[PDB]
Amino acid sequence: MTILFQLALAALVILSFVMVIGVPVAYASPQDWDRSKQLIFLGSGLWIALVLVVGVLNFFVV
Amino acid sequence: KLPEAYAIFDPLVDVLPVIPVLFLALAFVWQAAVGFR
Amino acid sequence: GGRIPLWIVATVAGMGVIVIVGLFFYGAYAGLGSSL
């Protein structure tokens, strides 16, 4: 499924770009530590998922 | 070339190698922010 | 009288030279002077 791989891959890019900015901002603002220690948590697992997803799909397109 | 599946990302792939030098510059932006204390 | 913080004017100024100079190194490969 071509467009489904390119969706999964840009999902990954977008989520990385969000995580690139928000993980260090979240970490150095303690006022909202617990506010966010689940957002990076869920980001991380989401991120890992897409890598695995983009990794398996690779074989049905490349 | 990249595989054709990933081709749309060629422009992103072309610019990724410069990113570690941005970290070096970023440290200086950061010190200007705290005024080189 | 101080309103805009110095580090921001430095980063912007800095990025502005990078562009202009980058452009000159581009021009070394394109158009006049490029051997082509």
Binding site: F17, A28, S29 | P11, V15 | -
Partner: peptide
């Protein structure tokens, strides 16, 4: 094309100063 490459790197390049920016606003631990 080259506007592709340049818009990538414009976005990646602003990503650093942004972190700094948002942490100074939200009075973070710079």
């Amino acid at each position: 094309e080259v506007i592709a490459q340049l818009t990538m790197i414009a976005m990646i390049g602003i990503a650093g100063p942004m972190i700094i920016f948002l942490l100074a606003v939200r009075r973070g631990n710079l």
